[PDB]
Amino acid sequence: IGTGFPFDPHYVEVLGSRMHYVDVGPRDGTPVLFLHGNPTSSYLWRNIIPHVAPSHRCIAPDLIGMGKSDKPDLDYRFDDHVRYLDAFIEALGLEEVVLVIHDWGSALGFHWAKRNPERVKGIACMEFIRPIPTWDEWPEFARETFQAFRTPDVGRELIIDQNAFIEGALPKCVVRPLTEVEMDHYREPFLKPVDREPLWRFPNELPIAGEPANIVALVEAYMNWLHQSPVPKLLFWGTPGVLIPPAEAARLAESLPNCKTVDIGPGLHYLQEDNPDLIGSEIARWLPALEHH
Template structure:
């Protein structure tokens, strides 16, 4: 299955080995603020819709090799969060979780057009936090959840990261000023180090070029700094921790169907976490993808895509 590409400024189409091009659409989510998104079926000819939500420091491009597997079964929508990908980068945007949530609320309300039970959410990283927060408040509009490397509460730093180097790096990222900010804003460390470090295979130069494209200028890297500072670790920040705790409790008690991907050793979802969620998530189909860290979409896209397609069609058969 070949990749699709989206037209980002600074990325030449012939630099990516692809024959499938998905054009970006744009939707106003505030005065002068546009959210860019892939939409494989704007005419809504499919009964099912899957919305793919990315996290830090990625974009809809993360789903490029998964969507072609899902497209025959459902309308596939993959937005770029504000400040990321090809979406607007408002100078006044603070990049906080609740600010992203407000923009996503507007986007999903327009895309879904208030269809009851209308969409499945495929969620990763900060896209999972934003998507699960929205799902908790709009359960009647959700058909099911696809989860991988998703955000959950971390009572302590030891719960967040198994390795001391990882803990120390993210603690450094959370310093108000100084070295952490220098690493993320000036040196672009999340793109240059954290992203490739979260993929088992080497990313190609073309792929790195595409991921770098939205953040070529340091002034556009504020979301890459803000997101690590929003992680709900040891109760901080309080407002994000409260939101994540609320949707986590809801998720464990929800009767929505779930498709849960996990890897070894994993990052946000380690093997002991996977064992917990396999047991505690209701109506859960669990899929072990094999070796993987955080960006499972880069290491196992075909498996993930095929499993989503199979899960969608099996659920349709059951419901009918």
């Protein structure tokens, strides 16, 4: 699995900040917009984009406060991310898109799609955010840790002061071992502890056991939309998974319209790190039939 990031930087000014993004591939056509989550960046997509770029434009932003994007002093709540990403998409003049989404990138992507349904030609998703109704529906192995993250004292100690999301949660949710070169790419945006605010706010925003209520409601709303939308969907899943265990993937296969599911083999949360070649090649193969209006 490749460790390099062979993409030229691009920057756009959004809401007073520069956001970094990958932009490769043909200029015409329907662009494919790749949205990472916590605590990652466009680096997460590095081994997937090369499968898609031969046929389609690939755009992969670093969310505000993350990657090579600027670091304004925000709370980095979901609503902040929504505002910056909405402004990013408009700054690039995107019209119709295909979304490729993961984790908080999937909350952003599904929420954008619900609001802009006529502009989404397809959604490829993996390990995406849905409401987790009770803590029993969160995987046992990660329960005590995420409960600790979701506190005002201990969670900040762990995530901000000790870098637990980068040094602990990230590699623990890749089946294969991440290399030190990979870890350094993930560490780079967060070398200064104070810059880790988004990494703590994100787990505190996850819709778990009814909290926070605003995010539960928003996520319920985009899931209701997804269940009734004809948009083509491509869902990748792994075993045992984290957010989307195998039995849930199977239920979604049958419940979501026009949904293709792909088993990637072993996987926890960062599926892109375990089987990027299958994810990329399946996305590439799936794109052409989406084009016709």
